[model samples]
Target chain A: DNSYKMDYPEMGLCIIINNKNFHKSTGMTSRSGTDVDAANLRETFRNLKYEVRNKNDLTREEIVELMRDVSKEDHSKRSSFVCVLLSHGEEGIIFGTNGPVDLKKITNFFRGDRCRSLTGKPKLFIIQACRGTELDCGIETDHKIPVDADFLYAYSTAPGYYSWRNSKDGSWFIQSLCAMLKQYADKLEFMHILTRVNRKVATEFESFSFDATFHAKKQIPCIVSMLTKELYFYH
Target chain B: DNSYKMDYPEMGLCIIINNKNFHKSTGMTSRSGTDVDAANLRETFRNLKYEVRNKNDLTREEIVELMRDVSKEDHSKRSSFVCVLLSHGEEGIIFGTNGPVDLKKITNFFRGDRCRSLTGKPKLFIIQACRGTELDCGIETKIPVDADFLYAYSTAPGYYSWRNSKDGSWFIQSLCAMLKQYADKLEFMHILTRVNRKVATEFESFSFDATFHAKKQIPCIVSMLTKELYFYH
Candidate 1:
């Protein structure tokens, strides 16, 4: 127990929201991809020993309300905050059904200025949504370093590109993340693992659309970080 | 000029790591899927009016070091910062060519207390990678109320799932959500539009995978929040 006094405190708190259905009220349903995504994300964080909160399909107002409640908490004892969203998307936006939303507004709430409780701590957002309509080119490249501290944004794919999926399985991004986190999270630095994620997405995944010209296109993920040190869910 | 009364200084900066060819090293020689995804993400954020510092395909050590450098900035005047990583991934980790990396170590650089300069302001991380080896079923539930200030995820199924490339799309979840943000930054109600788009698209888009017993699949997204507000790029 003496070695446990490293002063990191509890690493952080994470919120996971998985949307399986929408306000469109479609009875046509299968395992909601968002639900699967949320479950896996929660499991990954939980494995690291961080406290995680999971929420399933919600409306626009509900999304706002939940965040308000969490922000009101005392996060001073924690080192960072993480929020994950699993839902359908299009250009520069996410949905809660009954309407659309700006990604910035949701993140603004936890801003150090806005939420004093989390001042200085890193606030991470993992968004599993499409930025726009475009193709995935399966072209690989080396990973790059992130910008300054406090915020990190991880997107499933770049803007205007199609995010690949299979009906019986799940999304490409989540699966790759969970596999790496579970195996190498305890062994390597965070960004290193993310680099591997970039590789897998670029090399392993490809989308074969019905449109001949657009078929078998690929997608790649993007990571932006301003973190200052190593963050581990387990150690 | 009335709206300019609250002039929030430029506190947030973007580190646009546009890895133009990382996929090649990872055994992918084609440049179609990765190229489009990277371009789309970069342009989307640019439209949000961010001062973007973009870097194409860097090494693993370079990515770590670059993140360290960016994490140290003057964030007092800004509202938040954003970082986008466009690369390949395997469950739990991202690749650096040399090897794999844990996700936490990289994100910790900007922890609220760790990076004192950016004590306040939202630090956003947008990652596009895989997480697991299998897909799971979801339970039925009624949509809830009061779920603001949250994080959104994509691809609920693990390895069996896949991302869509049709219409040059990343998928429905994030694309629609971000688009809604473009349409409105108020009412804190636009996020749902993206979620709807996510569900609708996944349901509509499907194909057979040759591996894993030909398991049909889809992507999943998750979100975690603490408030109800509209955010912009």
Candidate 2:
């Protein structure tokens, strides 16, 4: 009903999947600015007292391997778990160097029945990828307790919409998220911080592509929470 | 970064579609305990300063008309909006007396382009209905903002939501209790999170059928909201 336990011996592990390069056969471009995102996230989460690990250029097998191996680690003394994916993606899928993988399959390894030491604790995911081809013309408006409990999915854009990247700066969602986490990981409640992230990405950033179709387009981060109690990086 | 402007002269209209009885043609049961939910919700939103209107037993067309009419009304002086549906439902649809209607079609009436006066304003929809055929077995657990929009659903997608014949739905019971206790004090998301916790921990399904007996439930909150919201200053 209140705050989540943030007083464990260590704050816990935060995995950053920096998927930058793709095989030529895959018809994908290298995620040029993703390194900037990975660096910023590493510094911010490290500053928040999490044990941060950065994985680069992982294939689908490696992605699955890392997640399963990490899930198998002892988390009894840890307070929370986080995995951030910065890659190219379509709706419901994130990419590896070789191919696309369903996020549901990867995330299922940490379910309540699958990963018990972290049961009843917060499991957070921040993804920076396009959900789909639809554009956000920007009119917007705007759970559960299952095996999928105690998790939060922070998406870069609403479903079936483009997640804009600056090619030089990084993805919109990650930049704002890193900035907000650094600024308020201690002072504000997690959702309140996310709301500010949503606003900053919505109001401050815009796609300035040369293509008229993608130029001047807007984006808003979508926050899907299954955490029952309030969450904070520092209590 | 701060609270929505809840200090407007009128706190805005809150529409409650309390569908208790269904048409005989459709094989749906009368929602016997919904009045208790409706009553508690009415008092809660009323006390919280909304212009509450409870519409009972509406048909599919009537539901659409009401939402459109409400959307067409001037909300220039109003602070925010709320719509509550107490009825039967499926994964993406809410049932009217005669048939099921898509929730997207109903909610789209208040889109920024469609309802300009309500642009950049908070619109809340509180739904109390069974979302699907799955029943939860208790293990333990937890449970958008479109800027200015929140959906407080009674149960997760594809799960049967429970209601007692006399006491009302677990979701609404928790929702009203939390709002009554903390509306003026807590951020709106925190209030809903506490409601989610209450419904998850305090309630268990007590049904006669063996497959449905002693199950658990959790409410779903989808926020597209871009700002922190508080019901009071």
Candidate 3:
């Protein structure tokens, strides 16, 4: 049952969509620490020998087009696929430079029926965006098959909750995720590493909003995985 | 890792929500084979020695209230909690006798903060319902931190789940058969794997309408288990 292998260093393509700037009419502020997040991710994956491609401030259409284009690549020889989205978001919607895009619309590009090269391989999506404006005051938490297989979604916060980020340090989820992967990627399974990410985000960090109502708020990362096999970065 | 014992015969609570009838306005046909599903589940869990409670044809509010009440029970003596929801559903809403309820709202009643007694225990949700009306054209393919939770769906997302008006659902029948055969021998996931194989390879729907004839179906098993679970030693 443990035979599924992900040769992380070979033939893996990591796509990073770092959307920090939005149009003035969009009523969104530019993300200050996102560059560091992108850089850290690029370096981290590169260290693991993954070929990384990073994009910046794409509009909704551009984001969709980019995914469709990437899905066309022949990934038959690759071990897995990763797409990281860093932006502002509401429940089920991620903000592009111009407007919002349904999270499902972007992800459907790689669904098994849509992306044949990636049909049975793992597709990991990491979203460093708030799911909603509600704060997680330290409460907690907690699919499917057919052609819709082998996908994993790691969201920064649970649905209907604000995901906290420091202007200088980056989002809590990404920072913790990178740290845990760096420490445990070679030794632990993917889900084990994610559990630690959930723990670190939930217990170690709290919002320090200048506004009294938002200060000391808490958050927890949410993982939705549908892979059929135990995923390991090493052989 | 195998040190945590499941004492299955002694502890565990099984809650079955069988929604057989719907209001006329809800436009849902009364489930025909649901009694058999419910009966089989009762006998299966009773054989495994779980304390079983079955509720029939509850409204949306009643379903939520029942879950809240069940979550409040003292489960320290139990190894896990199992809730089987047999109903008609779309995407994330499961229909009660009256109307639809968000699946999340019902399941959230057992979140770790709310259901402390089952905090470290497995909370398994077996949902036998259609996620949508789309069909699988024979194409194929394919957690753990908060500790021991699973959602086993009757069909893949955006697909129709088949039910035999006389026999029962493809999912429930296969699931009970596998559990009865392997619950004492294999770990929870291994048993579920067999359930998936049986549903995929053994079941197909034959209908008068050509659109539904020769239809294939598959089940989905999602896990958030923190430890390996063996229902018996």
Candidate 4:
């Protein structure tokens, strides 16, 4: 019976990491549609009354340092923490302007024992990136008691799969995520909203590549939650 | 609107790959409680009336070949397909007796385009293996457009999935128990959620080593089903 109640509007800071430009040597393309994603997120969370801090095109070390700095802030007066990372990525790493950063490095900063001020409060992360290069050709189908509680990760694609984003509309995952949150943030629990996002991304979007190899591929979002309580955004 | 009716009892084939031994050079320990797991699955599916096939200690190539062979079967009259892989693994690869095999290699065989026989049919994969070595430390609070496919993983990505030498894996036990109890009554995702709950609440490991003792674990279910599935026809 470990569940949580949501306290939005009174939520703590929201950090938006919009990494677009990459190091020349890395051979990574600049993410084309991330600005719209960042704008949408900032506006959405701002309406939710979160104090939003937006950073663009940071290096790996800078990303880690920012998270560490934020986690050290006194969160006793706040209800929760949210971070949205829009970047290019591989399996367990996300790209910064300069290089790749280990996701766990950023996330571990907010672990209960490390950030005592946020203990018992929710920490939410939405990552829009490719987990790998494998495509989901549609064959279907388809954690643990740890002391580290209250963290949820929403990844854009499954492990080892390419995540789809359009030059015009932004990422399928982010667009669907924002839409669902706008529709259900006040009425449904956090997980429920995410489930809808998953459904939306899965059923509604497919990659359109001029190259036949990448054309018409599908994408699905992955949600990993360690919340002990239900989260609702109702004021 | 794209929901699938459960024709499970009368149709489909279930293949179980029970890999317990590894090459001596691989330095992997043998799986002990797999016999119990295999038995439970066999009896449960047989009672449900699907033809069941069991393979033991297969090599990586053999595992691939078996899947290719099975995918070639005429499943025109069947309702769905199920494959249970029990082995040691890393993030995207499961182990065979000799070494590791890319999981996609095994599963790709049954993709809608590859296995025409299973196109639009429910293809379910239950994998019992460690996804990675990262341990979950307590801290805080926290698909699909395909016609029919599901992967029930024993642990989250980048974490060690636990197993009991005597009883079975935290995953397989909960899976079989939940399916046995709810197969006829609940939708497939509902059954999976219950399995997730059961494993989260009912089990924890007790090991002699400090790093392993009294540790906790949770299972992950990934689905790409284009339709909802009920196991009862």
Candidate 5:
């Protein structure tokens, strides 16, 4: 009874915002390996029986509209929801192709007061973006609001830290998240799986960039969880 | 095997920051039940074998210095650390007797690179304060922290964290309730989840002020703990 009811006909919707090519005016570099993260996430969620969709190069309003539109759909029959953001961001904000948007704006659409159908269901977000605060190998962050019950943010790195990605393999966080979910979505609790992902990202990956600032650094994903019960993403 | 090494010579120091009386200019109400929370926390952590110290009504500068001073100490002989903040705050900030302090300043002192002796040990902070956000529910944090940090916030963001003038705040009471019941029997995360459940289910607002009447709250846990944590090894 403590575990979530994840046995609906549909696992739920997973919308991935793959913002790679940024608008030049925003001073943001194009995310190179984000497409691979999209592919990995798409396949990973699909295997979990979710209706996964990937939206690319969305402007701030477009991203806003996308979540708004998704929240409009009836989710009474679904067991959970997921949104993955693969982009550049700093503390409390994520970038759309054109500019910055509050993480609250992206997530608040599905608040229990707003999206009643998905009330009491887990709304998981996988963020493969920097918190851009100021850390693995410690960081500081400022300003946070974006939390409600049954929500989880699986950030690629601790807040006020850089998120590492390989041009060939995508992000350290996404890779490990997918690997852990693929390996344990059924056999283990979701938190246990996320802990494994944290370990994997912390131990197995390190930045190899020749730049002295980025070289040989470490990263550990942070899990901001507000779930009150055990969650099992059973296949 | 998965738990942190909590068996050092000392269980660790537990600092209780009870900020009850605010300045006249600050316009903050005196926290009546906070002393009860401080006492409850002191005894609970004492029972858990921590070297408990209570700091009452400290100014912002003094609060800053206390954590700075504590972090500078040799914690190699200790296994973990716990800090309890009983104060008035909104989201992302907790108050001293005078004004607000960014939670990042309080927690970052214990970060790995900064406090080398306590690196890899568990650091737990229990915040008993008002979040003052609109809600159905949480962050006592905008905290971006290093590994092995656990923040147990009193209530979710955008809500008044409720306290009974007699019993204590709903969060600290439930937290102490669970920490007493299952500190060694269950994993730390599960115990926190149970705290959330108890706060969310057992308590509701009963105020004459209609704005706060019939409201509900749930505690927030922002855990960056890389491994399982238990009070007893």
Candidate 6:
């Protein structure tokens, strides 16, 4: 009954993560990709006033444990929750200290029906991981926005493709994310900025492979959402 | 009985979230962070196989409804599931169309102990919210790698923090760490390697803006594992 109140700053949370190392495969190397990705996202949220909880390089198990511990906490006494993950992955699995894990297995901890306290509120998860091993050439375009922005899932690549990163810089995704967040976190809605991110990643970034077969590989982002209003992090 | 066999492909499920045009606040400027954050992460996960599902800015009731829909599905029947969010939030709360909600409430749906089929397996959660407004710059030192990783956060400092445009990127913390795991998935001793990736790469890339303004900031990657393993995607 006491659910609809935008003035209630009591219910907000933010979590950020950045992982730059890979356990085995070495071709993907980006000196600042993780840091750049994390820093920009954190800055965007921080400007909004959400309590930010940040960590880095969590093993798959550690990630599971951390989520479990947080989930088990008393959310009945709070308002909303936010979580972010940044790591290297292939399919549905994320890495823990000892091994890899199913992504679904971890997110299930905070479903609406499962956690009574947060039954009628929003729950968010932001993840940055690889999808596959394919890479395409970058294409330039004049379009600046996408058609939709509800229940969106922004991805770094398509399917079975490799996501590239700059060794000196970070990644195309992170760069665009920070740029957009810093420029619009206080003005535009969450979706408007994401559209810009799509444009930046899609058009701004293009991989330059020395290998003849894979000359210029590109990585594009995807979004999925189910919201019906504008979202912001600031007062 | 059928808990062990590979019933779902690695890239069986995916989720997408995009929030566009929100009511602007005088104290606020524009909405871009959450959208970009959610999108980038979603893309990263989607490429891996999981059927991606998305939700944009929602009211309190709508947020709950979306989460309910996610919970209603039989995740046990699929290989894996993913959900990405992009909205306004506070310390421990997330914004819905109606109001704020606790993060824990939503994730409790698929806990290892709660979800029967997922028990003993792994349950992952990625958060992009703020904890508090306190800023602390820890002394600089090399972090030694140890244990199986679980959870990773973004900024160590609460309020006065850093965001990158070109140099040290933020966002994908544990995701990059997972990549390190791929290095030696066999006889997989590369867990530490993944942790190192999160720390060293970020360290080499970013510097603080506070006291150690010129000093580099590195993420402390932790792991608490019970055994050795692999994520054969």
Reference-based lDDT, each prediction = 0.55, 0.85, 0.79, 0.78, 0.82, 0.48
Candidate 3 residues lying further than 4 Å off, grouped into runs, are A1-11, A139-145, B1-11, B43-49, B111-122, B138-150, B155-158, B164-170, B173-210, B213-233
What global local distance difference test value does model 4 have?
A: 0.78
Q: Give one digit per residue, the lDDT tens place, for model 3 in B1-233.
A: 32235763456889999999999998889998799899988999888778999999999999999998998988888888899999999977788999999998988888766787777667899999989999865545402123345678887667888888778889899999989998888666657656766776677667799887766776776655545567775
**Model 2, docking class:** acceptable
Off by over 4 Å in 5: A133-147, B133-145
What CAPRI grade goes to candidate 3?
incorrect
- Give the per-residue Cα lDDT of candidate 3 at A78: 87
Against the native chain B, each candidate's TM-score is 0.69, 0.95, 0.94, 0.92, 0.93, 0.62
| TM-scores for the candidates | 0.47, 0.91, 0.83, 0.81, 0.91, 0.44
- What is the C-alpha DockQ of each candidate? 0.02, 0.32, 0.22, 0.24, 0.38, 0.01
Clashing residue pairs, candidate 3? Answer: none
> Which residue runs does candidate 1 get wrong by more than 4 Å?
A1-7, A25-32, A139-149, A209-214, B1-233
Better of 3 and 5 by DockQ: 5
Model 5: colliding residue pairs = A133-A160, A134-A160, B133-B158, B133-B159, B134-B158, B138-B156, B138-B157
Find the 10 residues in a row with the least total lDDT in model 6 chain B. Answer: B140-149
Residue-level lDDT tens digits of model 5 in B1-233: 35688878999999999998999878988998788999998888999999999999998898999999999999989999999999998887899898999988999899877887877778898888877856443322112237777788887655667789899888899999999999979778888877877776677666698765666677777777777777886
TM-score of chain A of 6: 0.78
Interface RMSD of 4: 7.3
What does the lDDT come to for candidate 1?
Answer: 0.55
Candidate 2: segments with Cα more than 4 A from true spot: A23-29, A139-146, B140-146, B208-210
Please say which candidate is ahead in lDDT: 3 or 6: 3
Model 1 chain B worst lDDT run, 10 consecutive residues: B140-149
Ranking by lDDT: 2, 5, 3, 4, 1, 6
Across B1-233, the per-residue lDDT of candidate 6 in tens digits comes to 11123345452344544443344432332344545455556655654545666777666666666766665665666654445444444554655544567765765554333343433233334444344443333222200011111223333213222334332234344443454335335312233223323333344322454543433222221112212324443
Model 3 DockQ (Cα-based): 0.22
* Deviation (Å) of A170 in candidate 1: 1.5
